[PDB]
Each structure stands twice: as C-alpha cells, then as structure tokens.
Design a protein around this ligand. Structure first.
Ligand SMILES: [Mg+2]
Ligand SMILES: [Mg+2]
Ligand SMILES: [Mg+2]
Ligand SMILES: [Mg+2]
Ligand SMILES: [Mg+2]
Ligand SMILES: [Mg+2]
Ligand SMILES: [Mg+2]
Ligand SMILES: [Mg+2]
Ligand SMILES: [Mg+2]
Ligand SMILES: [Mg+2]
Ligand SMILES: [Mg+2]
Ligand SMILES: [Mg+2]
Ligand SMILES: [Mg+2]
Ligand SMILES: [Mg+2]
Ligand SMILES: [Mg+2]
Ligand SMILES: [Mg+2]
Ligand SMILES: [Mg+2]
Ligand SMILES: [Mg+2]
Ligand SMILES: [Mg+2]
Ligand SMILES: [Mg+2]
Ligand SMILES: [Mg+2]
Ligand SMILES: [Mg+2]
Ligand SMILES: [Mg+2]
Ligand SMILES: [Mg+2]
Ligand SMILES: [Mg+2]
Ligand SMILES: [Mg+2]
Ligand SMILES: [Mg+2]
Ligand SMILES: [Mg+2]
Ligand SMILES: [Mg+2]
Ligand SMILES: [Mg+2]
Lengths: 56, 159, 175
RNA sequence: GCUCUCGCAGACCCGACGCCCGCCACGCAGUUUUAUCCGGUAAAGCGAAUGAUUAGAGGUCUUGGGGCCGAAACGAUCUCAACCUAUUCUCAAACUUUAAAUGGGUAAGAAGCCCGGCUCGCUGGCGUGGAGCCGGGCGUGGAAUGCGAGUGCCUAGUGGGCCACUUUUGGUAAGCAGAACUGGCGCUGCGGGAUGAACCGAACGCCGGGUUAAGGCGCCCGAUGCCGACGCUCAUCAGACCCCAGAAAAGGUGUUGGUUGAUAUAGACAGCAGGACGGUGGCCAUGGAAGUCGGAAUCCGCUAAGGAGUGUGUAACAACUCACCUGCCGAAUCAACUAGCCCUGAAAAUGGAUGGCGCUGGAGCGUCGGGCCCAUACCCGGCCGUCGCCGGCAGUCG
RNA sequence: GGAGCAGAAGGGCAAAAGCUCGCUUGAUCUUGAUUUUCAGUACGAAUACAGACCGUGAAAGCGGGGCCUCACGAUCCUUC
RNA sequence: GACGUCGCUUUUUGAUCCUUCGAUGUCGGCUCUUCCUAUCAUUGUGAAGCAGAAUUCACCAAGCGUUGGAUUGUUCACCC
RNA sequence: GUCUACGGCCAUACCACCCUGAACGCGCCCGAUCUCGUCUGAUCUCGGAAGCUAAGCAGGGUCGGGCCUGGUUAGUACUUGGAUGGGAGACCGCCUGGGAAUACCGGGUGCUGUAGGCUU
C-alpha cells in the first residue's frame, strides 16, 4: 500500500454567521481571519492549526 | 453564604498525599534559590508557618527576595478584571523549582553551541522548532499476507 | 450519517508505528457509505469499538470502492444487522433481491427506516453476503424464485395527471 | 488627547541596486502547540481506612444460653450463640486508596548568552558566597496563527433585570425560588416557527442584478403541474415537524417486520372416526371414588397405545367414552417473546381549530433523490455618509 | 497512631505538635514591608524580615503568645 | 381489591406573585339563560351471587326533568 | 564481594517465618573506681575485653502478605464541542475530540553519594 502524504494546505470557509458565538470560537475564527460568513482562506496544516480548526 | 476564613475549602489541597505524612524530607530544605528564578507554589500542610494562600496554591512566580527560611515571590493573581503582581513571603517547604524554565535554559545553551559549530564549520543549520508537520508519504508493506477482515459483533446482553 | 444511494468501500487501516512494534497489523472493513469521507469516519467508528485504536494514533492505508462483481445477475442478499429501537438493541436478519450489494444495503436502510422507524446512526450492518435461491428464508424472495414466473400489471394508475390537467375523457386503468 | 511604531517612494517611468550564501520590525492575544506544575469533581471502590449494610460457610477459646441418659472431670458432644477467619449482596453532599474530560498558572531569549575587571560595612577556613557596578564580543530576533500599540485626564448613565443549552440547590411541582458558564432579550429590525421580547437563520446606510440560510413547495401562499424512489398505516376521538402549546402504566388472534424454541413422510396442525381402558378406590380415605375427589401420593395394566386422569358437576355401579395410535385428509404448522404504525386505556364546562380549507395510489408516518421558492445574510455594481491612509496637490513650471 | 493536642469541624503531628520533668516570661521595646477581606480602603487576624534587650539549650537553633483555620471595634470625649 | 403502581381533573385547599393599588364593587340568597357529563330518573341495551318483584355493575346517551318546607346570613349541613 | 560512620530518595527498602555469615568491623558481653543517672549500673553515663554469632545486622529463601510496575478491565465508564437527533418523559443513540478505576493475570523487590576498613 502507498500512503500518500497528508496535505499541507487547507482551504477553510466560515459558513455560519456572527450571532451567538462563543468567545473562544470567536477568537479562533478571527485568528483564522474569518470575520464574515462565506469568508474563506488558506491555512497551513500542522498540529497547532489542526487543533484550532477542531476548536472551530 | 460562606465564611472568609483563610483556610476555607482547603480540606484536600493542604493535606498530605496517601502514605506521605510525617517528617519532611531534607532535600526540600537544602535546595537553593537565587533572586530571579522561577518557582512553583504548592504549599504542604505539615508546616503551618509561612504557608501561602489557597489562591496562590498551584501557581508559579519568580523569587525577588531571600531570607533565612522564606522567599519573597512575585506571582500574578487575577482579581476580577485585571491581573496584578502580588508579593508573597512563602517558605521553602511550600515552594519548588520550575523544570519549564530549566528546559528552556538547556535548549538555549544547545542553540548557542549549535550556532558556534555552524559558524566555524561553514553550514546553515536549523535552530527554531516547528509544530509537528504532516506525515511524509511512505509505503506500507503487507509482507505477503492479506490484511485481516474486521467485522462488528452481534449484540448480546450481559450486564 | 445520511444517505443517497450507497457505495461499498473497503477501508484498510492500522495503528501508527511506534518504536515498540515497528510493524503494526492491518485491518480491513467493508463499509457502505455515501462517499469515502463517510467511509473513513465509519471505519474509525467501528474499529474504535472493536480494537483500542483511534483516528489520531492510526492511519488509513487504503480506502477504495469495491465495484459490483456481477452487476447484471440478480442475486439474493442476506443482511445480518443490529440496531436499537427506543427500547434496547436487537439483532436482525433480512433478505433482499438486487443486482448490487450496495443496492441491497440501501434497500435494507430504506426498509428499516420504513418498518421500524430506525435511523441510519442506529443501524449497524455487520454482515452482507450473496445467497442462492434454495437457501433463502423469506417468502418475499422465495415467491420470486420461480423460473416460469408470470403476473400482470393489474391497476395502472395514471401518472401524468397534469398533462393534461383538464381533459374530456376519463382515464383507463386496464391495459 | 499625548507618547511612539509602520512607512509614504522616487514627474509620467519602474520591487529593489549592497556587505558566495544568508536576514526581513517590535511587542501583544477570551487561540493552539511544545514543555512543566496544580487540582479531588464525573467515574470508580468497599474480599482498601471511616461510616452504612445482606447472606450463607469453616474453626477453636469462652461469665454464651445450655443439653436431651452427662450433678458424677456439662462421663460427654452437641443444638445454639458470641467471637475469629476467608467469602458474598448493596451504598455515601458533609467517605476514600485510585482517578479523568473540560480547566488554572508559568516558560518558549538581546532585559538573552559568554568573557574579563572593580566595590561591599552583608557572608566567610579560603583567592569564599551573594549582590551591585564598569568594560568587551556574540543576531539564524530562537514554536504556530493573527494583530499597530502604550499611556494620562475628565466623565455620563447604570447599581429592579429577565430567558435558553449544559451543570446545579430548596420544593410534589410551577410560566416557583436561588446559583455556575456561555449566548441572548433588555438596547434589535429582518427571513422562518400561522400567531409570540428570548426559539431557528441572520444582525440593518439608500437601490438594481445574482445566490443562499433557517424554513418550505395541494390551495390560501412564492415554490415539486417531478409520469420522483422504497415501504408502513384506516382511526364510529387518524396523523401531520425544535422551543410548543397536551398524555402514562397496561393491553389488542388489527396489520407489518424480527428473535428464540418446538412438531412433522417411522406422515404434521385442523377436521371424518374405531379400541380410546383396566384389579389398583393400590396408597389416599366411607361427609370422597370398583371414572371424574383441598391433603402425602403414584406401580405392574396379561398392553398395536393407554390412567392411581386434564375429560362424563360426583357418596353415587353415574358412566358418555376425551387423552394414544392406526385407516382418510397430504404439507407445512405451532408457541413464547420483541418494536413499528394503528386501536383501547382517553371525562368539562360559549362554537372551534395539524393556522384554515381539506387531505387517505397521500396534502399522513419513516428513510432518501433531482429540481425549485425567497432575508435587510453573501457576491457584483451604483449612490450617500463615517473612518483610515497624519494619502496627493503651493510645479498655474507650454 | 485507631489516642491526645482548651473548645466546633477540617487539616496537621510519633525518640512529635502528644505525655512527664527542668529552667524561664519572645504574651517585652521599635521602624517599615507583605498576605488575607479588598475598592486592592480600614479594622481584625496573619506572614517574612530588620534593630534592641532577653529566655532556653552543650550547640546548631528555636522563641516576639496559644500547631493552623474564629475568638473582636473608628472619629469625638475620658483615663493612665 | 390489601401490599404496590400509572394517571386524569381544576367544582377543594394550598404553593406562587405574572396582570390589576391615578380602584375590575368583596359573602350569601333571589331572578334568568346557557353549557358540561364524571347519568339520579326517563329511552335503547349488555352483565349478575338477574326465578318474579326489587336491586347492583357497565354501554350509547346531557333530549328532557331533578321539587315544597323547619332551623341557620350562611355556601355547606340536618330533618319533615 | 562487602562492612562501618554520616546520609539522599523514603516499603522494589516494610512485615511474618526459615537458612548462611571468611577477615576487619558493628554488636551481644564483663564491671561500677571515677563522670553521671536510677526503686533497680535493666535504660542512661563511665571503666573494659574472658567468651560469642545465640540475638541485632547483612545476604538468600517463601507457588508468602504488602508495596512498585505492566496487562486486562476497556476505547468500557465518564467527558469537550454539535444537531429543527430519538423518546410523553426518564433517559438514550450518533457526529467531533479526550479517556479512567477495581476484581482477575504477569514481572520485580532497594538504588545510590562522601570518608574510612577487610577480603592475597
Ligand atoms: Mg442562532
Ligand atoms: Mg455556602
Ligand atoms: Mg458555611
Ligand atoms: Mg503561630
Ligand atoms: Mg471539594
Ligand atoms: Mg459519584
Ligand atoms: Mg467500606
Ligand atoms: Mg432603581
Ligand atoms: Mg429563575
Ligand atoms: Mg429598562
Ligand atoms: Mg449589545
Ligand atoms: Mg436580535
Ligand atoms: Mg417572523
Ligand atoms: Mg407554532
Ligand atoms: Mg436582492
Ligand atoms: Mg407555508
Ligand atoms: Mg403557488
Ligand atoms: Mg390516540
Ligand atoms: Mg541563644
Ligand atoms: Mg529579633
Ligand atoms: Mg396576585
Ligand atoms: Mg419573581
Ligand atoms: Mg388594586
Ligand atoms: Mg383602572
Ligand atoms: Mg369602577
Ligand atoms: Mg365591571
Ligand atoms: Mg358517557
Ligand atoms: Mg330541547
Ligand atoms: Mg506477593
Ligand atoms: Mg468518541
């Protein structure tokens, strides 16, 4: 079996609005620069980034 | 409701561990503390003199003052909406050092020796640390044998 | 887990190679899922219930769709499943007639939702295999086990009830 | 307001023009990562301490009762005890060996590193130790991601709150009372929930186009007027969508699926039927058996198979004749569970409410597909203002 | 340690912090710092020091009240 | 229908304090209408430890009726 | 290979019972003149050296008890975050992550610092 490399690039899209958001989720989303709905960006995948995606 | 006594709620934290009572071991007394280093605050309950408050139990500060039996520590405490640096006199049975700062200092010295060897030998080497990269494509040998077929079990009621 | 029409995947995975066992064993499941992302999720679910293994300390070494081997021959399928009602959980054995294994499993999902109000997150498919005609138990399949089978289509309900919407002649149901 | 930071780019020009390679600001953060401590809740435990608590078993001592023939060394050893030992059932907000998840703190460098020298009245076997000071050299700026920060004065209003997920105290409970955490409402319109401070979606300058969320798409009412898919369900109170606006224990040979067991060509099941019974009713009991009776009982029948009957309402010889098969009938049947929908359980006061009309090859329930509908949300465009760039123009220099 | 440590409870404690003797008055005189409640105000309580004068012990040391968590009180006036 | 256990109702009394204190006339009777059904009678039935008569338990059922007095302000009550 | 003296971590070191101990040592042991303490030279203090490993102590043993460390229990119990999930509720399933503790079954049973001895 050939296990390929798990990817280093992700595209993230904020898909929920800004009403009634937890503060930790709020801080992680604005560290991801997702301040609006449908507001995607590129992230580089490692442990720290994957855990804050798991948060939001 | 409740009292504002100085040891309210400290039934378990100021107690001793199980089968750990009695005489305090003497290495805790013969540690040394220079002013500037990072110490953990725990606060055992065999010694009642100089013991820290329950808000400072389980905290971490730096030493600013050394006396005969105690140490002045600068600790961050969070009052309602601000963090402020309190100065507490705590005894050496209640404190111990910080391996986090110890680990940082030994990787500082490792960085310095590594930069010296790189400069003398004429290379460029990595000094920072990077957060756990992805997982570097690879082959998985089956060693000829077929992978075992797993299958969910039926339901039986035991307990 | 929602649905659609299902595909069968084989998902092979293993624990991560620690420097204690440099070659951990591989495990393989057949998993009926809408797509391969759901397939990998259901793999980690099932293998975490069976073995002490989680998605963090493990990897998928293969996840690939099993195509139907003979998608032009009508087969009988026996499904061994477990599910849970509003009360406790039950084992169950169903039989279907289909061309594809994933088609019969999809048939089983819609049938369990119809007859027992059971949801797909409640259902766990634990075995699916191809039964011949002489080994079936259910009369709804054994009645189709006949070489000279013959029946009409008795009461043909009109379907284009809106083309036209207003006609002058009443429809006919005998054909 | 102030103190700083990034820097403005070289008329139109055009990333750059210094010293093999290399470097691209600082600090900060309702965030992660890497290290490193902290904790006693959830769970668990009681053949671990403290308390609580169920049941047997085994042993030999004793202010155990006592134990029948032992006063006589209870000649004795037994019945019971206590007690001990090994087990066993079940618990703890104010118990606990163990012990999470989520969490709290600290660290992740130039205020750092490493060389010399000097001062000390502190410390001292010592040139000590510790602290301070003066010089010098080291930049790969020593995890990720994001971001301009610091700092002072003056200051209004408020100090009745309320609701929701989860946790949680009192209370039978409450649209009750009281806490924790986050979000909301208050202070907030808009799409959906028929209707509604708080639910679900989404937060709003004035407009055009496009597309969506939550929610829908028989008609009211925009959208399924799809030749939509597979089933389930008939209700003489059907059912019909977060909060939410109404039901349980218990049942059903209503129908649908399933689990487990059993019987059957040495012929099932149901019906057409023959011997289908006997001393011994031995025993039991004559207030009851030479069949069928509250009690303990229970055999052999001289039998193709027959009781101490479940058959014939009995003290009765009543006595018809079922149980057991062989001849027809010739292939599947029976039982106990289980859970879907429906039904029973199911009674209130003006006439009434899946929102209404109605709907039953669904306009119901479950699992799904393709379309489609539209919010003040998102995209593109226009216009208005605010903020920022401390942006550009004094070169009107044909 | 299932005892005791003045008392409520919790923690702590064994050649102890318990019990018994011996000697004493660190329960004294002073300035500041800190913690606790906290507005980072005060009181109360407490913790590290520093400067005297002492106690005890062979000594290192320990001691400015009670093993720790409670046991207490501004201005004005009076009194020493 | 004991030991248990599941409900309904708002004709009891509590619990609560949401509305009303710049005012919703506060007990009972009299009068008069309408509704409910958890049916006392009457219509049609089923059951009985229903022979008849009387009665009891259920079902469809609220169409129709459910009185005159003594005492008490009484609602309730008790008697003729 | 060990031991004394002082220790550090403080049971893998404890507890119960059994076996072995060369040489130095550590003890047991002999005594009360002095020092010093007792009701008692038993303890404490002092002065010794005839005998001894009996005991302490050390090492080893025990299908040992405890303790330590793994496995199992178990991806179970519990839990972060999510849903216009289910169910009349009580509660339960799923998605995303984390993840225990008995019973039961293994293995182990003191390491080590400074100074000074003995062991041909
Ligand atoms: Mg919302
Ligand atoms: Mg309280
Ligand atoms: Mg209290
Ligand atoms: Mg004190
Ligand atoms: Mg607690
Ligand atoms: Mg618990
Ligand atoms: Mg116990
Ligand atoms: Mg007010
Ligand atoms: Mg409340
Ligand atoms: Mg207001
Ligand atoms: Mg606001
Ligand atoms: Mg709003
Ligand atoms: Mg609306
Ligand atoms: Mg509604
Ligand atoms: Mg528009
Ligand atoms: Mg509508
Ligand atoms: Mg329309
Ligand atoms: Mg009903
Ligand atoms: Mg002294
Ligand atoms: Mg002093
Ligand atoms: Mg009121
Ligand atoms: Mg209130
Ligand atoms: Mg009023
Ligand atoms: Mg009014
Ligand atoms: Mg009026
Ligand atoms: Mg009025
Ligand atoms: Mg009725
Ligand atoms: Mg009339
Ligand atoms: Mg053992
Ligand atoms: Mg999980």
């Amino acid at each position: 079996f050939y296990v390929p490399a798990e990817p280093k690039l992700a595209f993230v899209i904020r898909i929920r609005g800004i009403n009634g958001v937890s503060p930790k989720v709020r801080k992680v989303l604005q560290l991801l620069r997702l301040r609006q709905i449908f507001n995607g960006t590129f992230v580089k995948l490692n442990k720290a980034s994957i855990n804050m995606l798991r948060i939001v | 409701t409740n009292t504002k006594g100085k040891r309210r709620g400290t039934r378990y934290m100021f107690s001793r561990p199980f089968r750990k009572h009695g005489v305090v071991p003497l290495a805790t007394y013969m540690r040394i503390y220079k002013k500037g280093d990072i110490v953990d605050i725990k606060g055992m309950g065999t010694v009642q003199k100089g013991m820290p408050h329950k808000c400072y139990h389980g905290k971490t500060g730096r030493v600013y003052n050394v006396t005969q039996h105690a140490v002045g520590i600068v600790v961050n405490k969070q009052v309602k909406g601000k963090i402020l640096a309190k100065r507490i006199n705590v005894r050496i049975e209640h404190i111990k050092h910080s391996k986090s700062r110890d680990s940082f200092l030994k990787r500082v010295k490792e960085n310095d020796q590594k930069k010296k060897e790189a400069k003398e030998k004429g290379t460029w080497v990595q000094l920072k640390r990077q957060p756990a990269p992805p997982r570097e494509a690879h082959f998985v040998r089956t060693n000829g044998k077929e992978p075992e077929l797993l299958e969910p079990i039926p339901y039986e009621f035991m307990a | 887990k929602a649905s659609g029409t299902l595909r069968e995947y084989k998902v092979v995975g293993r624990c991560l190679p620690t420097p204690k066992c440099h070659t951990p064993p591989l495990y393989r499941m057949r998993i009926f899922a809408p797509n391969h992302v759901v397939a990998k999720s259901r793999f980690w679910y099932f293998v975490s219930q069976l073995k002490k293994m989680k998605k963090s300390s493990g990897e998928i070494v293969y996840c690939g769709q099993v195509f139907e081997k003979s998608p032009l021959r009508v087969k009988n399928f026996g499904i061994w499943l477990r599910y849970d009602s509003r009360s406790g959980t039950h084992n169950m054995y169903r039989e279907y007639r289909d061309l594809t294994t994933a088609g019969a499993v999809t048939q089983c999902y819609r049938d369990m939702g119809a007859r027992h109000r059971a949801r797909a997150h409640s259902i766990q498919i634990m075995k699916v295999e191809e039964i011949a005609a002489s080994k079936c138990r259910r009369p709804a399949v054994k009645q189709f086990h006949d070489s000279k089978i013959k029946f009409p289509l008795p009461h043909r309900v009109l379907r284009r009830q809106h083309k036209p919407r207003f006609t002058t002649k009443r429809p006919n149901t005998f054909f």
